[model samples]
Target: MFSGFSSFGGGNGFVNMPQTFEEFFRCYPIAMMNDRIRKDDANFGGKIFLPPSALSKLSMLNIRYPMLFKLTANETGRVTHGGVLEFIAEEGRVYLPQWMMETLGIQPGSLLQISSTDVPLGQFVKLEPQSVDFLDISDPKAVLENVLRNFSTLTVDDVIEISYNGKTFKIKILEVKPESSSKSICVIETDLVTDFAPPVGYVEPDYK
Candidate 1:
C-alpha cells in the first residue's frame, strides 16, 4: 500500500540535528547524479539511492516520512535532503540531484555528512508551464509523476524541465508550502498537493 518515499526522524528540535546525525548515524559522500540510480516520487519529489544493506543499519532511525536523510557538506556547511531508494548505489556513497550538489558547492566524489531529520510531509506545491507542448501530454495524472522522477528541488520562479514520451516540458515553481513543519525541508519525503491550469487549448471533456 505504501509506494512512497522512505521516512526517518531528523530530530526532536531540542538540540541540534548533529548529535543525532553525527553520533547516531555515520555519514558519506553523494554521487553526482547517477542516471541509473536516481529515483523520484510525484508524491514526494526526489530520492537518495541507498545500498540494499542500509535497512539493517538504519533499524532504529524511526522515519515517519519517506526514508529521508539529510546531507551536509562539511566544507561549505551547506545542507540538503534526500529519500531512500533501496538496492542502488555503492556503500559509503549516495546519489543526489545536480541542483543539490551545485547549491552545496560539492564536486563529484566529495563526501557529505548524512542523517535523518524529523519533519512533516509536504502539503502543497504550485507550478507554471514553460511551453505549450506540455499541454499535449496524453495522460497528465500518470505521466506527470513519471516526468518529475528526474528532478529534486523546485525553486520559486526558477525553471526546470522533465522529459516524457519523446517530449520535454519546462516548468517554474510558483510556490512550495511545507504546511506540516515549522522549518524548511526538501519535497522528497512528503505527500505533495499540486494545482495547474488546463493546458493551453485543452478542451473541456464532453458530457455524456
Candidate 2:
C-alpha cells in the first residue's frame, strides 16, 4: 500500500516506489472447500495470491505488508481491487479468485496489469442490485462489509460480487465517496447504502 504518505525518500526509499507488473494470470477457485463452504469461501470475495518468487520481485518496493492492490486487464479497461496473499503457485505471475475473474472478463491465460495502491479502506459504498435474489441475504450489510475488506481499491462503476449464506450476490457501485477525500463518501471507516434491486437487467449466472 502506498498511503501516498511514504515516498521516494531518497537512498533505499527509491526502491519502494510503486510499481506495476503485467501478465499475471487469473485462476478459478480452489476445490479444497466443499460445496457449502465453497460458496462462503468464494465470499473471500476479491484478491490475488502471489508466490514467494513474485513477491521477491516486489521486495524493493515501499509497499506496506498486508496491503491492497489494483489489477487491470491489459487489453480491456476492466479493473478491480485485490489483496496480496501467500500462495504455492508459479512465479512471475499471480493467482485470483474466479468470482473476480468475471469482473475483468478475461479468459484463462489472459494477462493483467497489477499494481500496488493506497486507499483508505473506504468511506461510502453504494450497491445497486440487478435481481431480487440479492434480497435473500438475512444480513447483507454486515456480510458485505466483511467481504469488502478483501479488496484493495475500487474503481468507479465496477460490478463486484459477494456471497452470503452460500448464495452468490452481485452489486454495482453507483457511488463511492471516500471520507479521507470528503468528496464522496477509512482504514475501516465507511458508510454503506445498498438497494434491494436496481434495474441494471443483467442476471448473474450461478457459476454452479
Candidate 3:
C-alpha cells in the first residue's frame, strides 16, 4: 500500500513543481525499508530524509505526464477551500484528493500540466507523480464527456501502456465500479504487494 507523502524540490518548499508518481513509490521502498530495519536500534535509527545524492539519479528518471480539466457550473459553483477547486479526469467531474489538491494548489480557472508515471503490477497498476494546473474555464462538460466517451469502453481488466522519458510501463485496470450516475467512473488499483504488517498492540515479542 502507498503511505506518506513528500515533496521534491529546493527552497521555501511551498512552490509547486512537477514530479513523477513512479519516483514517489521508489522513494517509499527506501524510506520504509530503512525505517523498519532501524526501529529497534536507536543508535543507527533515525529518519532517513532524501539524500542529495539521490537527486541526480531521480532526475535521470522521467515520470511526468500531463492532465487537463474543464470547469462546469455545477463543479465551479461548489464552495472551494480558499477559492480553489479540485477536479480529476474520470467518468464524471470527480473531485481530486484533498492532499493532492493542497499539494498542487489547484483551483478553478487554472491551467496545469501534471506529470505522472504508471507502474504495472502483475494484474494492477499504480499511478504516481500526480500534478495539476489551473486553466481558463471553457466547456468543462464537453471536455470531460469527450474523454469519457473515447476511453469509456475500457474495462477493469484492460491494461494501458504508458511511455515517458524513454521508458515504458503497463498499467492494468483492477476494478471499475460505477456510481448512480449514467456516466460510469473507472477506478485504478495498483498491484503492489507487501508482507509488512504492524505489530499487535502491547503484545510481548516472545509472548505471541
Higher-scoring candidate on TM-score, 1 or 3: 1
- lDDT tens per residue, model 2, 5-31: 765647644332233443355544433
lDDT of 1 at 115: 65
Q: How would you encode candidate 3's per-residue C-alpha lDDT over 1-208 as one tens digit per residue?
A: 9966886666654533323322121111222234455332221111122223333344466432211121122223321111111222122222222222333344533332222222221232222211121012254234322322222122333333333334333333344333222121222232222111222244324435
- The C-alpha lDDT values of all candidates are 0.50, 0.56, 0.27
- A best-first ranking of the candidates according to their TM-score comes to 2, 1, 3
Once superposed on the true structure, which residue ranges of model 1 sit more than 4 Å away at CA? Answer: 1-46, 51-54, 74-78, 87-91, 97-100, 147-161, 166-172, 180-191, 197-208
Model 1, residue 75: C-alpha shift (Å) = 4.8
**Which stretches of candidate 2 lie above 4 Å from their native place?**
1-44, 57-59, 130-138, 179-208
Determine the backbone clash count of candidate 1: 15
C-alpha TM-score for every candidate:
0.54, 0.61, 0.18
Q: Order of all candidates by lDDT, from best down to worst? A: 2, 1, 3
lDDT, model 3: 0.27
Residue 85, model 3, lDDT: 19
